[model samples]
Target: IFVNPSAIRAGLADLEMAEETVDLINRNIEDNQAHLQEYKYPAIKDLKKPCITLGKAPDLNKAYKSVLSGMNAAKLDPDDVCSYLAAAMQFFEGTCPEDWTSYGILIARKGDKITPNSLVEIKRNDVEGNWALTGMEMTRDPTVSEHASLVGLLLSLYRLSKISGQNTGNYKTNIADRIEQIFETAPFVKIVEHHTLMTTHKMCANWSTIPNFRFLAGTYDMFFSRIEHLYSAIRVGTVVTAYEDCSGLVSFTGFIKQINLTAREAILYFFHKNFEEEIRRMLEPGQETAVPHSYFIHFRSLGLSGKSPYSSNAVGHVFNLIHFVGCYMGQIRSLNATVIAACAPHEMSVLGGYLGEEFFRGPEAVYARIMMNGGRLKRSHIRRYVSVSSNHQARPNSFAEFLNKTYSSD
Candidate 1:
């Protein structure tokens, strides 16, 4: 008691105790491929749903089948493109070039700014091929639904079209000539393929951030080549492509309930048992859906997002999808920490921001994995676009260079 003058009591009256340990239960997860897709739940009896209006779903298949039947062959290469004649005949036939009759056309005016490196791949050739998208002169993006039917109409004649600093000429008239060219020469190349590398199935996921990347390109290519009767395109157990918004945030495997062609929609039952408990606790059981004629980009639905799939678009950027837990399986030190960091708000990710050295030693530490993997996925994989590696600069440096960044200590 000798030196305790007035010091035994609490120092301040207002500020509450700031630190304490609370023992609480929080759920998390880990899984295998077979178990990963086991998302199922009993339908909540009498689940109430909302009435949402949508645009009249256009039937591109008629054009697809009609164009193909009229052609010499059945299937076409580069499934990414559709016939320009369809563009003219179905989408913009009556309108003049002054009007933008065509749908989802990616154009560039002379005065507009496009990346310098992008202009030369046969003039914007590797542009969208490398990036997935470009030439926002008309529309900024194309959803999976309209991707081929609209933007797929890209014609060689889009060449003679004019663009400059001033005149933003009439699109309807500009596109009309492609029709006349259709009449004069009857170029079968439009419907016949040979372009669009992302031409896998005729159908595809949402607009990708990097449209031309091999993953999307091959998926595009395959879907176009394989899917018949369009209605049967999706099925139970289909692994919806992982993209920015839903991947690390709230990922899932698709379970088919019903494909309501009349409504032009599908009732998708996502298997959410595979995700973190924090993510799944927020999801409702038994109610899941998607529009057939609708579109998604980077894997998330593009317009008017609703109550299906992974709740909704929480995050807005693409990050590692969990399917390739094995891609860098040898590298992950702490899965939860890394997952949390990648799943963090997009804007907060940078060298000195939310993610710290604890999760990834450096941004390069994380990026190199994606670059190497993306590169490998770009070129080497014998299968799907899932979890591939790269070697471009983007590709790892070399065997010795590979050990350089993280192994630089020696």
Candidate 2:
């Protein structure tokens, strides 16, 4: 999902080594083209190497912001729900941040789990242009259980609400109404900024990612089944276009330097590129920047570093919220329910972004997550994560009011 320079070296090396091996194998096939009878084979020299180069690692700040925007929009945070997600990126086959090796070790200790060290070893070899790991395809550990990543995301929200105090059994009735509105819209687009979780899904056809993911223990797959259950349990629903959001883009920009396209362009293509047929029944409505009251949000997380899965920072998270909320609601000059959620300490400011200022920064978001943002974070902030508490009740106007409210109930 997120990577540093070490990962990039491994990926590129793997690619290069693979190409060299392919060239060697194809040469033999080319020589026997006619002898193979009826089978067609191109001249080895004619084969073209891809023009795209394996670029840089993902930017941490940009990735965090992107995660925040989506998590906040969805109202799910790791500390409150889906805390296990922090492990997803820890043990992929290619590369991961060395600092988080504890998760990798845990995953590796699981039966058939691929260790990050092994991933790095393979990737390191690839970066050195070694071709040995090319044919060594890693299997998803049989013991690993997971839901479809996208579908499981919803289930995570359900868990978050329960933790916050709202009986999902009761709120499910209310959620049914909103689900219908979102699904009626049938918006199935996904836009990501700098993050590659989806991008890797795109490239998994050939890439050897870090191996720890092999031991998913079926937890991730359950997320998928949960989505199907939600779809059936709710009377009606809308197809949400899941984008990585604003922070993802900025974080992406910082690390990858530049994407081939802009955030909107990438998101649009993701929709048309993957879920086109499933969502064709919906109209092709568009734009938060240009249109007012025309868009809805994805989800977001609210947690501190290492403490939360997706709530890596606040600036990127809030920036994304600002873009989505400010663009859709602010531009229209009308009132539309801007439903949202989080799973961290509640504060007006965190990292560098001010909830009041409408600007977010990395330090502010992180500080807020740790509950050291120099502002009062309501227990309701954490409690709202478990219930259907509204935005008004979630992030209060002042610290004193929030504490008074939080302690009285708790």
Candidate 3:
């Protein structure tokens, strides 16, 4: 009785059901392409701006008709009509910039560099010459979902290439292979990794004591110790049999679940505490701390979906967050361990305390407010502002002064 047979059976049943549904849909699409095209909406003509909502599009009826046949052919539930419609709309308009109005507008602000550099060509044109996505639009601080979308788009090209007997060209390689190659050699990915590593290294070199980093590390250690102790307590023969027997099937699955749980707990309770509290304390008597809409919008754009445990923000964020935590975990783990161990809590409070204080409060507030209000601003200007604020040598008197000092033609 070490394993839950019923739970295992139920999980397999659910997976089987899902696979059948997918197989049915694929078969229907393949068999009914000519039949489905008859219902293709003509109103989705090449337009400058796509309709905001699919329901409101002029070809909504046609779009529904196009998808309904497939639904009928597959014998899918009528309850799934909206979902089908959404999928159809994506297929029809996924290439159209106006279709993704919210994201499309962001392109002018962030620039092409923000989109994963690898998928630029795919976004430019699918196997068939179509403007699927500009590949330029993205959040100011792009997240894993945005990156994942680019990756998916690139893979879609390979699929299309196969179907059309067209050369995949550079994308002939498998996606996982491409990911490994990019992470290893892609200039942007390397830059991000380099930025984190170098900043940590420099912080360690400059500071002898980082109080916030020490507190965070100690807290993480205590939390980790408790987890280890609890797990050890449960390492009886029965539980060991249960866990070990299921390890192959669920090792990565359970590992990521725990990591996600740890991240949520750390974000809400452990990380950014001192900085948030300080901001609260420093606010005016009547003012209350409220994060800008941009933060919420950025989070919303991740579009996380799925069932319990497995569903959530992109796994990339989870890994990156974990790496960040590890960076502050202990003396041996981080380059700045020596400096961090010597600091008092009142000194450098957290990983980015020194910079966070200025960025979150200083130009960040202004920039976020403007952006949230539909005002346009360049990301480079924002980066320049951050660089000026973070620089120890030069101190600008005001936000305008900071901009002038950084951007002025000297």
Best by lDDT: 2
**Residues 1-410, model 3: lDDT tens digits:** 01122223332232212222223323422432331120111111232221211122223333333322222232222212222222322221112122112212232232222211111111111122111221122224433332322222222221222222224433333432333333334221321222222222222331112221211112222122122221121111011111111111122232223234331222222122232322122221211112111111111111111111211111222222222233222111211111212212222222222222223233234334434644433454345434443442322232223233434425
Cα lDDT, all candidates = 0.24, 0.25, 0.24
Candidate achieving the largest TM-score: 1
Q: Point out the worst 10-residue segment of candidate 3 by lDDT.
A: 234-243
| TM-score preference between candidates 1 and 2, better one | 1
Candidate 1 per-residue C-alpha lDDT over 108-128 given as tens digits, one digit per residue, 9 for 90 to 100? 233333221111121112212
How does each model score on TM-score? 0.24, 0.20, 0.17
Across 165-257, the per-residue lDDT of candidate 2 in tens digits comes to 234344543443343233333222222222222222222221111121211212222112122232221112111111112232233222111
Compared with the true structure, the alpha-carbon lDDT of candidate 1 equals 0.24
Clashing pairs in 3: 50-98, 95-132, 209-343, 210-343, 211-344, 212-349
Sort order, TM-score high to low: 1, 2, 3
In candidate 2, how many Å is residue 276 off?
33
